[PDB]
């Protein structure tokens, strides 16, 4: 039904507008496995991530047809939806590159 086109290691943060603080998505510090999933029937994409130790879902966010994906640093990327700002702090420069090009691909095919 739906395919994982990439798997990077990153710390998923969401932004706390109230306090100008980046907070760990899910409330708990640590790395997660972050996927970009492709629903082959619908041609729709979403970012899904489960923390490495707990297998708790810390992020599950649709990728819309025009998402502005900002690569702030070579290891920190961020994008915005109607509610939050999501950040991925990747474990490696390479993790970020493959995730970034899967994201850039997903936006071209949407």
């Amino acid at each position: 039904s739906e395919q994982s086109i990439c798997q990077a290691r990153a710390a998923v943060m969401v932004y706390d507008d109230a306090n100008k603080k980046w907070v760990p998505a899910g409330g708990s510090t640590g790395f997660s496995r972050v996927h970009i999933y492709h629903h082959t029937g619908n041609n729709t994409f979403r970012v899904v991530g489960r923390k490495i130790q707990d297998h708790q879902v810390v992020i599950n966010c649709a990728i819309p047809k025009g998402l502005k994906y900002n690569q702030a640093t070579q290891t920190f990327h961020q994008w915005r939806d109607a509610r939050q700002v999501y950040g991925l702090n990747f474990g490696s420069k390479e993790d970020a590159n493959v995730f970034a090009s899967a994201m850039m691909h997903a936006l071209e095919v949407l």
């Binding site: 999933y37 629903h39 979403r46 879902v57 649709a62």
Partner: peptide, 6 residues
């Protein structure tokens, strides 16, 4: 595995 797509 991924959650239901909500």
């Amino acid at each position: 595995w991924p959650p239901p797509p909500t």
